[PDB]
Structure 1
Amino acid sequence: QVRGLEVGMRNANDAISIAQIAEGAMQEQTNMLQRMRDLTIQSENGANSTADLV
């Protein structure tokens, strides 16, 4: 039990790190998606032109 738990402790510290990395990457995807929302709102002017939308 004593040695079994010690390996089990390191087993869970590994799972924490995996969840930590995935969470960090999704934060950057959220910021870029917010910028796409602004461009879609900005792309709705009636003073733009065909070349401006491109």
Structure 2
Amino acid sequence: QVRGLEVGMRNANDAISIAQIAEGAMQEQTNMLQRMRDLTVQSENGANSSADLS
């Protein structure tokens, strides 16, 4: 039991590592989506022309 609990805590820390990497990756994706939202709101401007839209 003692030895198994030691190895199990090692596995639990491995799981925390995986979750932490993935969760940190999703933050930059959120950031870029916010930027695209601003660009889309800026497209709704009756003074833009086709070059500005491009």
TM-score (norm 2): 0.98
**1:6-52: CA deviations, max 9, x gaps?**
00000100000000000000001000000000000001100010111
Instruction: Please give the root-mean-square deviation of Cα atoms over the aligned residues, in Å.
Output: 0.4
Unaligned ranges ≥5, structure 1: none
Name the % identity: 94
The count of aligned residue pairs is 54
Segments of 4+ moved more than 2 angstroms: none
